[PDB]
Design a protein around this ligand. Structure first.
Ligand SMILES: *[C@@H]1O[C@H](CO)[C@@H](O[C@@H]2O[C@H](CO)[C@@H](O[C@@H]3O[C@H](CO[C@H]4O[C@H](CO)[C@@H](O)[C@H](O)[C@@H]4O)[C@@H](O)[C@H](O)[C@@H]3O)[C@H](O)[C@H]2NC(C)=O)[C@H](O)[C@H]1NC(C)=O
Ligand SMILES: *[C@@H]1O[C@H](CO)[C@@H](O[C@@H]2O[C@H](CO)[C@@H](O[C@@H]3O[C@H](CO[C@H]4O[C@H](CO)[C@@H](O)[C@H](O)[C@@H]4O)[C@@H](O)[C@H](O)[C@@H]3O)[C@H](O)[C@H]2NC(C)=O)[C@H](O)[C@H]1NC(C)=O
Ligand SMILES: *[C@@H]1O[C@H](CO)[C@@H](O[C@@H]2O[C@H](CO)[C@@H](O[C@@H]3O[C@H](CO)[C@@H](O)[C@H](O)[C@@H]3O)[C@H](O)[C@H]2NC(C)=O)[C@H](O)[C@H]1NC(C)=O
Ligand SMILES: *[C@@H]1O[C@H](CO)[C@@H](O[C@@H]2O[C@H](CO)[C@@H](O[C@@H]3O[C@H](CO)[C@@H](O)[C@H](O)[C@@H]3O)[C@H](O)[C@H]2NC(C)=O)[C@H](O)[C@H]1NC(C)=O
Ligand SMILES: *[C@@H]1O[C@H](CO)[C@@H](O[C@@H]2O[C@H](CO)[C@@H](O[C@@H]3O[C@H](CO)[C@@H](O)[C@H](O)[C@@H]3O)[C@H](O)[C@H]2NC(C)=O)[C@H](O)[C@H]1NC(C)=O
Ligand SMILES: *[C@@H]1O[C@H](CO)[C@@H](O[C@@H]2O[C@H](CO)[C@@H](O[C@@H]3O[C@H](CO)[C@@H](O)[C@H](O)[C@@H]3O)[C@H](O)[C@H]2NC(C)=O)[C@H](O)[C@H]1NC(C)=O
Ligand SMILES: *[C@@H]1O[C@H](CO)[C@@H](O[C@@H]2O[C@H](CO)[C@@H](O[C@@H]3O[C@H](CO)[C@@H](O)[C@H](O)[C@@H]3O)[C@H](O)[C@H]2NC(C)=O)[C@H](O)[C@H]1NC(C)=O
Ligand SMILES: *[C@@H]1O[C@H](CO)[C@@H](O[C@@H]2O[C@H](CO)[C@@H](O[C@@H]3O[C@H](CO)[C@@H](O)[C@H](O)[C@@H]3O)[C@H](O)[C@H]2NC(C)=O)[C@H](O)[C@H]1NC(C)=O
Ligand SMILES: *[C@@H]1O[C@H](CO)[C@@H](O[C@@H]2O[C@H](CO)[C@@H](O[C@@H]3O[C@H](CO)[C@@H](O)[C@H](O)[C@@H]3O)[C@H](O)[C@H]2NC(C)=O)[C@H](O)[C@H]1NC(C)=O
Ligand SMILES: *[C@@H]1O[C@H](CO)[C@@H](O[C@@H]2O[C@H](CO)[C@@H](O[C@@H]3O[C@H](CO)[C@@H](O)[C@H](O)[C@@H]3O)[C@H](O)[C@H]2NC(C)=O)[C@H](O)[C@H]1NC(C)=O
Ligand SMILES: *[C@@H]1O[C@H](CO)[C@@H](O[C@@H]2O[C@H](CO)[C@@H](O[C@@H]3O[C@H](CO)[C@@H](O)[C@H](O)[C@@H]3O)[C@H](O)[C@H]2NC(C)=O)[C@H](O)[C@H]1NC(C)=O
Ligand SMILES: *[C@@H]1O[C@H](CO)[C@@H](O[C@@H]2O[C@H](CO)[C@@H](O[C@@H]3O[C@H](CO)[C@@H](O)[C@H](O)[C@@H]3O)[C@H](O)[C@H]2NC(C)=O)[C@H](O)[C@H]1NC(C)=O
Ligand SMILES: *[C@@H]1O[C@H](CO)[C@@H](O[C@@H]2O[C@H](CO)[C@@H](O[C@@H]3O[C@H](CO)[C@@H](O)[C@H](O)[C@@H]3O)[C@H](O)[C@H]2NC(C)=O)[C@H](O)[C@H]1NC(C)=O
Ligand SMILES: *[C@@H]1O[C@H](CO)[C@@H](O[C@@H]2O[C@H](CO)[C@@H](O)[C@H](O)[C@H]2NC(C)=O)[C@H](O)[C@H]1NC(C)=O
Ligand code: NAG
Ligand code: NAG
Ligand code: NAG
Ligand code: NAG
Ligand code: NAG
Lengths: 126, 440, 126, 126, 440, 45
C-alpha cells in the first residue's frame, strides 16, 4: 500500500488508509538541528494530537472509518456517492468541500459524540 | 436515497505551511564532535534511503517563490555558521597595525605585532594576505593597513577542523507534513506540474555555497530550464539550470601553508606561510560553454522573440557580490566572471582569472566576519558549474539587443537552484464526505 | 457554547463539554521565549496525554461521556442526582468530592477497562 | 498490583495491566538538565503516542485488552493457550515470538480496523 | 481448534535502549542559585523515594559494557562542567610572566603583573602555586614561567559557589523506558543475574570524580567483586569493588587562603595566600589494606589459578593519570599511589604522600582547563575507598608471577564502578498472542 | 549641576592606539579611584 495516492478515486483510495495514518506520526549545549528537531517533533506531536482530539469529539478514534446521523446539508454539494467513490478524488474533493469544512468540523460534534448520554438518561434512568 | 456527514481518517489532503524542517544525511563518522560545519552528527541521520512514491494523477500546483524552505534554509545555514564559529576563535587579537610589502600580482607580504600566548609579550609575526583582505589605516603609508572588517565588524576564524566542504543535507519534513516533488525536468516552479511524487525527506540538496553560478546542483532533461518569480521584472532574479554540465578546476597556483600562532593561550590563529607567486586561475575551455550558452540563449528567446542576445559582466557593485565566488577546501575565491560572460548570441545559423580572499562577509551580514582558514595545500576544486543566476537588463531597450549579466542578488536564490522541485505541505487527515450509516 | 461556566448546575453544565475539551489541547539558535513555548507545549501535551491515558484505563476516550458499573461507595457524598444536575455545580462539586477521589481514580479501573477479557474467557473460550 | 511482573505466567501476569500502562506515560536560557528533560519528555510522549497509534490501527485503544478475527498463522509457534497463559511468561514469550511479530504488527491491521466500513457498505447501503 | 491474533496492552516486554536519561536528587534548598556544579535544582527533584519492585522470576542478561549510560553520563558530566564554568570566569588574561621563589617541598611562592579592574593599570599581585601548575617559558630563569595549560589551552576558574562536592544524582529513565537492577552483590556485569528488580530512577550513583581508586561507591557482599569487558584483554580495565570498606582523610597541612583580585571588573581571580610548609599527605594504616588485598588477590586467583601476585605502581604516563586523584571540597589532589600499590601476595598460609594542583585537565580534554579555586582551609577529605581500577600486566609471563598496576584508564570506568548494577531498557507494550474472540 | 564633562584613553578598532575619547557623565555614573583628584575616577560598577 502506497502513501498519498489522492488521484485514486475516493473509495479506491480508501483501499489504503492506515499507512497514511502512520505518516501522521512517524516518517516511515546544541547546534540548530538539535533545537529544530525538538520543535519539529512537538509540532507534529501536537498536530497528531489535535486530530486525535477531533476523533474524540467527532468520535471514531476507536473505529477509524467514521459514522454519525449528522445531516449532510444540501447547501454543500449534491454530488453522488457513486461519483465520489469511483470518479472523484480527495484533494479535488477537499477543493470542493473546504468552503463548508469549518461548518462541518463544528456541526459534526452533535450529540452522538458531543452529548448522547444526556439522551441515555432516558434509556437508563427513571 | 438519503445522506449523513461521515469521516474517513487519514485520506490524502494537503496545503502549504510555515512548518519547520530538519536535517538528514549519511553519517560521516558518528562522532558528535566531528570536523563539520553543516552536520556534526547533531543532525540525526534519518534514513539515507529516499523512500519516495508515485503521485499518479495528483495534480499539485507548485510555488517556488512563496515556498517556506528558502527563508528557512537561509536562517538555518546562518545559524550553522555561528554554531561552528562560536566554538572556535574570535579575532579581537588581530585588528591591528599591519606592515606590508609588494611581491610577484597583489598577494601582499606582511608582518604585525600582537599578543602571544601570554597577555604581556608582543610577538612580531608574519603572514601573506591577498590585497582584498585589507584597507589603509588612514593614509598611503607602508606601516598603515588594517583588516577589511575592522572598520565596522569583528572577525572569527573557524578551526581548519570546521570544513566548509559541501556535504549534502536532506530536509525531512516532520510527520503530518511531507514533501511533494515535481517528477519532471520539463517544468518551471510556478503553476501545475502534471507528473509528481511525494517523499518524507528531499533527495540530496547540496548546501551549494554558490554566489553567481550554480555549482554542484543537478541537471535537467528535454530542455535547458529557466525559473523566475516574474520574468517581466527585469530587476529580480532569473535562474538557469543546464541540460549539460561544465566542470571547473580552479587553483591557488602558489605553494602556501598554515602558520599557527597563539593569540591568547587557548586561541590559535592561522597565519599564511609562503613557498613563484601567480594569480588564482580556472581552466575551462571556451567552445563547450560558448555553444551551451547558444542553447541558453535559444531557450531564453522563447520568452522574448528573435533577438540577438548578449551575456555581459557584473560591474561596479561590491566585489563580495560582483565576482563569482565559492569555497575550495576552506578558502574562498572571487573570480572576474567577465571572461566567461562577455559574449554574443545571434539568431542566424550560429577560462577565468581570479582573486583569493582570506576574509568574507557571507550572507551580507553586519558584524560576524569569517577569516577563512588559509588551507595547508595547493588547493584544487574539482567541481561542476550547472546553472546561472542571470539578471536581464533593467534598461528595457526593446526589439534590438535585450541582454543579461550574471548576479548574486540573493543567496536564497543560490538555494532556489534545487529547491524548486520540492513543495512542503501539511497533511490534514480530516476527510469529511457524505455517506449514510447508524452507530454500531 | 461557553468555556468555564461551572456555576451552571451539573446537568445544564453538560450542555457544554467538547469546547472545554478543545481548551485542554489548543488555546482557541535557541532563545528565551522559544524555550518557554517548547516547554509549555510539552507540559500541556504530556498533561493532555495523561487524561487521555486515564480515558484509556477508565475507558471512554471514545465515548467522551463515560459508563462503568463500578460502585458508587456510600462512604462518599450521599447528595441526590436531582440536587447534582439541577442545583449543584462543578468547582463546588469537586471541592466536596476530591477527599474521596484518590479512591475513585483507582477503583474506576476495574474489570470493564482492566480485566473484562479475562471474563470474555467464559464468553468465547471452552 | 506491581509493575514489571513478567515471570507471572502470561494470564496471571494480566492480573496486572493498567499500572504498567501508566508507567508507559508517567513514572508513578538553555540549561543542561533542562534541555535533556525536554528531549526526554518528547521522546516518551512520541513513543507513547506511537503505541496509541498502534492501538488505533490495530483497534482497541477504546478497549485495552484486544480482539480481532485475524488468523493466528500456524507458521508461528504452536504453543498451547494453556501453556502460554499458565506456564509461559512475557519476556520469554516475546523472545520466542519476535521472529514472527513484524508480520503480525502489519497483518493485525486487517479490515476490522483497516477497511471494514467498505463492508458496512453491504450492511447499510443499497 | 482455531485461534486468532489477540493483543494484551502494557504486558512486560523490554529490550536494551539507546535512550536519554535525566537527573533527580533531594532538594538542597529549592534555590536555582544553590552554589553547585551537578544539580543546583536545574536538575528536577523527581521523587527521592526509590519506588522499586521485585522482578521475581524475571531472568535477565545484564551488559555492563554495551550499556549506553557510561557514554551518556560521561558526555553529561563534561557538559555540567562547561555549563558551570561559563557562569563564572574565563581566565583569558592570566597566562603571563610568572616570577617564583622556592620555600620549605614544591609549593612555589610567586608574583606577577596583571590588569586590575581597569584595562590600563598594571597591578603587582601575589599567589602560591604547587610546582605542577607551571612550566618554564623558554629557559631556566627565575622570572620565566607560564601556567601549564598556556602551551595549548585556556583556563576557567569556577566560582567557589560551584562546589564540586559530590551530591549524588539519580538517573530517571523517562516513562516507557525503565531501569532493571541486578539484585545481588554475587554478580559480575555480563550474562545472567538470577535475582533482579526494576527502578524508575537509580539509587544515587555518586559521581565523585574518582581517577584510579573508587571512592564513595557502595560495598559488595558474599565475596569481593571483579568486573571487566574481557579479562583476556590484559591491557583494558579491571574494576574491583570491596566486601569491606576502607577510609582515607588526606590533608593540606598548610594554613592557606583565598586572595581575591579583580582581573577585569567582573572577574575575581582567586590567588592563593600563605600562612612551616609540608607536603600534602594521607593516613590509611597498612595492615587493614594489606589483608584486604590478600582477599582481592584471592578473588583474582579465582580467575587465574594459583599465582603469587603483586600490585605495583602506575609509572611513566601523565601525572594527571598516573597518580590517584580526586577533589576535596573544591581543590584537587594527585597522590603517588605507589605506597599503597607496592606489595606482594603469595598463596601459602599468608599512608600516601601527595601533590596538590590548581590546574586540572579533567577528562583529558584539549582546551577548557579548570583552574580549581584554592579552597580557604586546612582542607580535610573524610571519605571511603571501596574499589580499584586495576590493570593486569602485558607480561604474559607463562603461568608464574602475573601481576597488576592501578590506572586512570577511562573516567567512564570510574562511573562503571556503580553503573554495572543498572540496565536501561525500552518497554514495548505490544503483547501479540493467540487466543479466540469476535468483535463486540 | 552634577553633569561632569570627561575624557579617557581606550583602544580603537585597532588593538594598539590609545585613542583619546570624550563623553559626558551624570555624576552618579562614577566614583573616585582612591583619592579626591581630577584624573582619578572609575565607572561605578
Ligand atoms: C562540489 O564541490 C565540492 C567542493 O566545493 C567538490 O568536492 C571536493 O572538493 C575538494 C576540495 O576542493 C576536493 O579535494 C580533495 O579531494 C580528496 C579526495 O579524496 C577521495 O578520493 C581519493 C581518490 O581520488 C581516495 O583515495 C580518498 O580516500 C577519498 O575517497 C580529499 O581527500 C580531500 O579532503 C579534498 O576533498 C575533492 O576532490 C572534491 N570532490 C570530492 C568528491 O571529494 C565536488 O567534487 C563538487 N561536486 C560536483 C558534483 O560538482
Ligand atoms: C565521599 O567523598 C566526599 C568528598 O568527595 C566526602 O564529602 C565531604 O567532603 C568535605 C570536604 O572534604 C568534608 O568537609 C566539610 O564537612 C562539613 C560537614 O558539616 C556537617 O556536619 C557537622 C557535624 O560533623 C555539622 O555541624 C554541620 O552543620 C553539617 O551538618 C561541611 O559543612 C563542609 O562544607 C565540608 O563538606 C565533609 O566532611 C565530607 N562529608 C560530608 C557528609 O559532607 C564524603 O564524606 C565521602 N562519603 C563517603 C561515604 O565516602
Ligand atoms: C616576506 O616574505 C619573506 C620570505 O618568506 C619574509 O622574510 C624572512 O623569511 C625568512 C625565512 O625564509 C625568515 O627567517 C630567516 O630565514 C633565512 C633563510 O631563508 C635564514 O638564513 C635566517 O637566519 C632567518 O632564519 C625571516 O624572519 C623573514 N623576515 C622577517 C621580517 O620575519 C618576510 O617576513 C615577509 N615580509 C614581511 C613584511 O613579513
Ligand atoms: C612593533 O612594535 C614596535 C615598538 O615596540 C614598533 O617600533 C616603532 O617603529 C616606528 C617605525 O615604524 C618607529 O618610528 C617612529 O614612528 C612614529 C609613528 O609612525 C613617527 O611619528 C616617528 O617620527 C618615528 O618615525 C618607533 O620609534 C618604534 N617604536 C615605538 C615605541 O613606537 C614596530 O614598528 C612594530 N612592528 C610591527 C611589525 O608591528
Ligand atoms: C512555466 O512558466 C509560466 C510562467 O513563466 C507558468 O504559467 C504562466 O504564468 C503567467 C504568470 O502567472 C501567466 O501570464 C499572465 O497571463 C495573463 C492571461 O493570459 C496575461 O494577461 C498576463 O499578461 C500574463 O501573461 C500565464 O498565463 C501562465 N500560463 C501559461 C500556460 O504560461 C507555467 O505554469 C509554467 N509551465 C510549466 C510547464 O512549467
Ligand atoms: C569581450 O568583448 C570585447 C569586445 O567585443 C572583445 O574585445 C576585443 O578582443 C580582441 C581579440 O579577440 C582584441 O584584439 C587583440 O588586440 C591586441 C592589441 O591591438 C592585438 O595585439 C591582438 O593581436 C588582438 O588583435 C581587441 O583588442 C578587443 N577590443 C576591445 C574593444 O576590447 C573581447 O575579446 C571579449 N572577451 C573578453 C574575455 O574580453
Ligand atoms: C608544495 O610542493 C611540495 C613538494 O615540494 C608538495 O609536497 C610536499 O613536499 C614536502 C617537501 O617540500 C614533503 O615533505 C617531506 O616528506 C617526506 C615523506 O613524507 C619526509 O621524508 C621529509 O622529511 C619531508 O617531511 C611533503 O611530504 C609533501 N606533501 C605534503 C602534503 O606536504 C606540497 O603538496 C606543496 N604544498 C602544499 C601546501 O600543497
Ligand atoms: C514465579 O514462578 C514460580 C514458579 O516457577 C511461582 O511459584 C509457584 O508456581 C506455581 C506454578 O505451577 C504456582 O502454582 C502452584 O503449582 C504447584 C505445583 O507446581 C501446586 O502444588 C500449587 O498448588 C500451585 O498450583 C504456585 O502458586 C507458585 N507459588 C508461589 C506463589 O510461589 C511464583 O509464584 C512466581 N512468582 C511471581 C511471579 O510472583
Ligand atoms: C614569598 O612569600 C612572602 C611572604 O608571604 C611574600 O613577601 C611579602 O610578604 C609580606 C607579608 O608578610 C607582604 O606585606 C608586608 O608584610 C610585613 C609584615 O610581614 C609588613 O611589615 C609590610 O609593611 C608589608 O605589609 C609583602 O607585600 C610581600 N611581598 C610582596 C612582593 O608582595 C612574597 O610576595 C612571596 N614571593 C613572591 C615572589 O611573591
Ligand atoms: C612588572 O612590570 C615591570 C615593568 O613595568 C617589570 O620591570 C622590569 O624588570 C626587569 C628585571 O626583572 C628590568 O631589567 C631588565 O630586564 C630585561 C629583560 O629581562 C633585561 O634584558 C635587561 O638587561 C634588564 O635586566 C626591566 O628594566 C624592568 N622594566 C621594564 C619596562 O621591563 C617587572 O619585572 C614586572 N614584575 C612582575 C612581578 O611581573
Ligand atoms: C561472571 O563473568 C563471566 C565472564 O567473566 C560471565 O560468563 C562467562 O562469559 C565468558 C565470555 O563470554 C565465557 O567464556 C568463554 O567460554 C568458551 C566456552 O567454554 C571458551 O572457549 C572461551 O575460552 C571463554 O572461556 C564463559 O563460558 C561464561 N560462563 C561462565 C560460567 O563464566 C558470567 O556470566 C559472570 N557470572 C556471574 C555469576 O557473575
Ligand atoms: C589557620 O589556623 C587558624 C588558627 O589560628 C584556624 O582558625 C582561624 O584562626 C583565625 C586566627 O588565626 C581566626 O580569626 C580570628 O577570629 C576571632 C573570633 O571569631 C575574631 O574576633 C578575630 O578578629 C580573628 O578574625 C578564625 O576565626 C579561625 N577560623 C577560620 C575559619 O579562619 C584556621 O582554620 C586555619 N586556616 C584555615 C584557612 O583553615
Ligand atoms: C592617556 O595616557 C597618557 C600616557 O600614555 C597620559 O599621559 C600622562 O599624563 C600625566 C598627567 O595626568 C602626566 O604627568 C605625570 O603623572 C605622574 C603619575 O601621577 C606623576 O608622578 C608625575 O609627577 C607627572 O605629573 C604624564 O607625564 C603623562 N605621560 C605619561 C607617559 O605618563 C594621558 O594623561 C592619558 N589621557 C587620558 C585622557 O586618559
Ligand atoms: C490515475 O487516474 C487514472 C485516471 O486518471 C486512473 O486511470 C484509469 O482510470 C480508469 C477509470 O475507468 C480505471 O478503470 C483505470 O483502471 C485507471 N487506470 C488504470 C489502468 O488503473 C489511474 O489508475 C490512476 N492512477 C493510479 C493511481 O494508478
Ligand atoms: C615594493 O616591494 C619591494 C620589495 O619587493 C620593496 O623594496 C618596496 O619598498 C615596495 N614599495 C612599496 C611602495 O610598497
Ligand atoms: C565590466 O563592465 C564595464 C561596463 O559597465 C566594462 O567597462 C568593463 O570592462 C567590464 N569588466 C571589468 C573587469 O570591469
Ligand atoms: C447561574 O445560576 C443562575 C440562577 O440564579 C442563572 O440565572 C444563571 O443564568 C446561571 N449562570 C450560568 C448558566 O452559569
Ligand atoms: C630559593 O629561594 C630562596 C628564598 O627562600 C632564595 O634566596 C634563593 O635565591 C632561591 N634559589 C633559587 C635557585 O631559586
Ligand atoms: C614507579 O615505577 C617505576 C618503575 O616503572 C619505579 O622505578 C618507581 O620507583 C615507582 N615509584 C615512583 C614513586 O616513581
Amino acid at each position: 500500500g502506497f502513501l498519498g495516492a489522492a488521484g485514486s478515486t475516493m473509495g479506491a483510495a480508501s483501499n489504503t488508509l492506515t499507512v497514511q495514518a502512520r505518516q501522521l506520526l512517524s516518517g516511515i549545549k546544541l547546534t540548530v538541528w538539535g533545537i529544530k528537531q525538538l520543535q519539529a517533533r512537538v509540532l507534529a506531536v501536537e498536530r497528531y494530537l489535535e486530530v486525535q482530539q477531533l476523533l474524540g469529539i467527532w468520535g471514531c478514534s476507536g473505529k477509524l472509518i467514521c459514522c454519525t446521523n449528522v445531516p449532510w446539508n444540501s447547501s454543500w454539494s449534491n454530488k453522488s456517492l457513486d461519483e465520489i467513490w469511483n470518479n472523484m478524488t480527495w484533494l479535488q474533493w477537499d477543493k470542493e468541500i473546504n468552503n463548508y469544512t469549518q461548518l462541518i468540523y463544528r456541526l459534526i460534534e452533535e450529540s452522538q459524540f458531543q452529548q448522547e448520554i444526556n439522551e441515555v438518561e432516558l434509556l437508563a434512568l427513571d | 436515497e438519503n445522506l449523513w456527514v461521515t469521516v474517513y481518517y487519514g485520506v490524502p489532503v494537503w496545503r502549504d505551511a510555515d512548518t519547520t524542517l530538519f536535517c538528514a544525511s549519511d553519517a560521516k563518522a558518528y562522532e558528535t564532535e566531528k570536523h563539520n560545519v553543516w552536520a556534526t552528527h547533531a543532525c540525526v541521520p534519518t534514513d539515507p534511503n529516499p523512500q519516495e512514491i508515485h503521485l499518479d494523477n495528483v495534480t499539485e500546483k507548485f510555488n517556488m517563490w512563496k515556498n517556506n524552505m528558502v527563508e528557512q534554509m537561509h536562517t538555518d545555514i546562518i545559524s550553522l555558521w555561528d554554531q561552528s564559529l562560536k566554538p572556535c576563535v574570535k579575532l579581537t587579537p588581530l585588528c591591528v597595525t599591519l606592515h606590508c610589502t609588494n611581491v610577484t600580482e597583489g598577494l601582499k607580504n606582511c608582518s604585525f605585532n600582537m599578543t602571544t600566548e601570554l597577555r604581556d609579550k608582543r610577538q612580531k609575526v608574519y603572514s601573506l594576505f591577498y590585497r582584498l583582505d585589507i584597507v589603509p589605516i588612514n593614509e598611503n603609508q607602508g606601516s598603515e593597513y588594517r583588516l577589511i572588517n575592522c572598520n565596522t565588524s569583528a572577525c572569527t576564524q573557524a578551526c581548519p577542523k570546521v570544513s566548509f566542504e559541501p556535504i549534502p543535507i536532506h530536509y525531512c519534513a516532520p510527520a503530518g507534513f511531507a514533501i511533494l516533488k515535481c517528477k519532471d525536468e520539463g517544468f518551471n516552479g510556478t503553476g501545475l506540474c502534471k507528473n509528481v511524487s511525494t517523499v518524507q525527506c528531499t533527495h540530496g540538496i547540496k548546501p551549494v555555497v554558490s554566489t553567481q553560478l550554480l555549482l554542484n546542483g543537478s541537471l535537467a532533461e528535454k530542455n535547458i530550464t529557466i525559473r523566475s518569480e516574474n520574468i517581466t521584472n527585469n530587476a529580480k532574479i532569473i535562474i538557469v539550470q543546464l541540460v549539460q554540465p561544465v566542470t571547473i578546476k580552479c587553483i591557488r597556483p602558489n605553494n602556501n601553508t598554515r602558520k599557527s600562532i597563539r593569540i591568547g593561550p587557548g586561541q590559535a590563529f592561522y597565519a599564511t606561510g609562503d613557498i613563484d607567486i601567480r594569480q588564482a586561475h580556472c581552466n575551462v575551455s571556451r567552445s563547450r560553454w560558448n555553444k551551451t550558452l547558444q542553447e541558453v540563449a535559444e531557450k531564453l528567446r522563447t520568452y522574448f522573440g528573435n533577438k540577438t542576445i548578449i551575456f555581459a559582466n557584473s560591474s561596479g557593485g561590491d566585489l563580495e557580490i560582483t565576482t563569482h565566488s565559492f569555497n575550495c577546501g576552506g578558502e574562498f575565491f572571487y573570480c572576474n566572471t567577465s571572461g566567461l560572460f562577455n559574449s554574443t548570441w545571434y539568431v542566424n545559423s550560429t577560462t577565468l582569472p581570479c582573486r583569493i580572499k582570506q576574509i568574507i562577509n557571507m550572507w551580507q551580514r553586519a558584524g560576524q566576519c569569517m577569516y577563512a582558514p588559509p588551507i595547508p595545500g595547493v588547493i584544487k576544486c574539482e567541481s561542476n558549474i550547472t546553472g546561472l543566476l542571470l539578471t536581464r537588463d533593467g534598461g528595457k531597450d526593446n526589439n534590438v539587443n535585450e541582454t543579461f549579466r550574471p548576479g548574486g542578488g540573493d543567496m536564497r536564490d543560490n538555494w532556489r537552484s534545487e529547491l524548486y522541485k520540492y513543495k512542503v505541505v501539511k497533511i490534514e487527515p480530516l476527510g469529511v464526505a457524505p455517506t449514510r450509516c447508524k452507530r454500531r
